[PDB]
């Protein structure tokens, strides 16, 4: 003798902002599921991000190119924010080549099949000289969480090329998660509640897949609990 | 002295537990722990402090 929650309509207000609803939730499980999901989403969602960059005419992060106004370090800082969706491979090499005066935005990346540039207007640099030309190759990996350069330095693995520029990896697409349990008038019941989870992401992970994966992880840990050895 | 060679090293230092932080009004402190985002309090809207 129980009820059980069914995934219902998933409204999309913007590309980044989303509302997901769960209608038939038993009394008391509203807050439990809300909080559990919030934790799993904020903590464990896998994403892809740039790990290191090689630009041609630059020895180290602190030098400067002719005809650009940003420092190289600020260029890395801009790349850290680049939101990209990789489908098949784990490590992709994107190529950016632009010349002439203008703002080098993310759209100018060489269009590959498997990679989706979510925000093509996102700026990267500004050229300021007719003959100034920038070429670069950005290596993008898949991962979970937050990994800084300095920890990965232990596993250098022949970092010998001085042209390599390491970037801290924020392997996480979800920026914000909130949930509300509000009275769910079901046609034959008195006191039932519906959970509405509104989530804001960088526009890479789709809501359905996020929620499914989170529920998967929590269910897996519960599976670990079901059996008890006592041996 | 025949000649001299000077070399500059540059090092990027990130904040870590034990460093000293202060305000403008005389309040001080040592950073004691770095918490995950989820543990921190959040207002209804979901923004953590």
* Experimental method reported for this structure: cryo-EM
Contact A148 B45 (CB under 8 A): no
User: Which residues form the domain of A119?
Assistant: 46-171
Q: Between vectors from CA A88 to CA A143 and to CA A163, what angle results, nearest 5°?
A: 60
CA distance A102 to chain B (A): 31
DSSP state of A28: T
Q: Would you call A116 helix, strand, or coil by DSSP?
A: strand
The beta strand positions in chain A, using DSSP E, are 7-12, 17-25, 47-55, 84-86, 91-99, 102-105, 115-117, 123-127, 133-143, 145-147, 165-166, 169-171, 174-183, 193-201
Q: How many CB pairs under 8 A join A and B?
A: 18
From the list A225, A207, A209, A220, the residue with the least C-alpha distance to A13 is A207
Cβ-Cβ contacts under 8 Å, B36 against chain A? 43
The residues facing A135 across adjacent strands are: A97
Pairwise CA distance, residues A207 & A201, whole Å: 9
> Distance between CA A90 and CA A69 in Å, rounded?
33
Q: Minimal CA–CA distance to A129: which of A58, A69, A54, A62?
A: A69
Residues 6+ apart with CB under 8 A from A89: A114
In whole angstroms, give the CA distance from residue A215 to residue A132: 51
Cβ-contact A99, A125 below 8 angstroms? no
Q: Residue A223, SS3?
A: helix
Mutate to test the interface with A, among B37, B47, B48 (most CBs of A within 10 A): B37
Adjacent-strand bridge partners of A137: A54, A95
CATH number at residue A56: 2.170.120.12
- From chain A, the residues in CB contact with B38 under 8 A are 38-39, 42-43
Contacts of A177 in chain B (CB under 8 A): 46
Task: Classify the phi-psi angles of A67: left when phi > 0, otherwise alpha if psi is within -120 to 50, otherwise beta.
Answer: left
Give me the residue from A39, A150, A198 closest to B38, CB to CB: A39
Distance CA A91, CA A76 (A): 18
C-alpha B48 chain-centroid distance: 18
Residue A41: name the closest of A134, A133, A177 by CA: A177
B47/A123 Cα distance (integer angstroms): 26
Residue numbers after which chain B breaks, C to N beyond 2.5 angstroms: none
Determine, for residues B46 and A176 on separate chains, whether the beta-carbon distance falls below 8 Å: yes
Residues of A within 8 A of B44 (CB-CB) are: 178
The CA dihedral of A154, A159, A162, A167, to the nearest 10 degrees, is: -60
CA-to-CA dists, residue A179 to A22, A30, A120, A134, angstroms: 11, 9, 31, 45
Residues A64 and A72: their CA atoms lie apart, in Å, by 6
Smallest Cβ–Cβ distance between B36 and the set A43, A150, A200 belongs to A43
**8 Å CB contact of B47 and A176:** yes
Task: Identify the H or E element spanning A29.
Answer: helix A29-44
- Reduced to 3 states, what is the DSSP secondary structure of residue A124? strand
Residue B38 burial (C-beta neighbours within 10 Å; 0-12, 13-18, 19+)? middle
Q: Give me the numbers of helices (H) and strands (E) for chain A, helices first please.
A: 4, 14
For residue A224, report the phi and psi dihedrals to the nearest 5 degrees. Answer: -55, -40
Place of tokens 């722990």: B33
- B42·A148 Cβ contact <8 A: no
Cα A197 to Cα A19, A55, A151, B34, distances in angstroms: 6, 42, 34, 27
Residue partners of A138: CB distance under 8 A and separation at least 6: A50, A53, A79, A82, A93, A94, A95, A96
Breaks (C-N over 2.5 A) in chain A follow: none
What phi and psi, each to the nearest 5 degrees, are found at residue A78?
-70, -40
């Amino acid at each position: 003798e129980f009820l059980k929650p069914r995934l219902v309509d998933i409204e999309q207000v913007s590309s980044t902002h989303a509302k997901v609803t769960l209608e038939p939730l038993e009394r008391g499980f509203g807050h439990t599921l809300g909080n559990a999901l919030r934790r799993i989403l904020l903590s464990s969602m896998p994403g892809c991000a740039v790990t290191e960059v090689e630009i041609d005419g630059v020895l180290h992060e602190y030098s400067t190119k002719e005809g650009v106004q940003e420092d190289i370090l600020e260029i890395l800082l801009n790349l850290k924010g680049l939101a990209v969706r990789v489908q098949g491979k784990d490590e992709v090499i994107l190529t950016l080549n632009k010349s002439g005066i203008g703002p080098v935005t993310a759209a100018d990346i060489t269009h590959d099949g498997d990679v989706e540039i979510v925000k093509p207007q996102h700026v990267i640099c500004h050229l300021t000289d007719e003959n100034a030309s920038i070429s670069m190759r950005i290596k993008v990996q898949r991962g979970r969480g937050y990994v800084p350069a300095s920890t990965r330095i232990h596993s250098e693995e022949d970092e010998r090329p001085i042209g390599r520029l390491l970037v801290d990896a924020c392997y996480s697409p979800v920026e914000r998660i909130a949930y509300n349990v509000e009275a769910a008038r079901v046609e034959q019941r008195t006191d039932l509640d519906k959970l509405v989870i509104e989530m804001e992401t960088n526009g890479t992970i789709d809501p359905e897949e996020a929620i499914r994966r989170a529920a998967t992880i929590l269910a897996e840990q519960l599976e670990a609990f079901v059996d008890l050895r006592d041996v | 002295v025949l000649k001299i060679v000077k070399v500059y090293l540059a090092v990027k230092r990130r904040i870590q537990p034990g460093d000293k932080m202060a305000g403008r009004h005389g309040n001080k402190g040592v950073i004691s722990k770095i918490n995950p985002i989820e543990d921190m309090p959040y207002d209804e809207n979901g923004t953590p402090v």
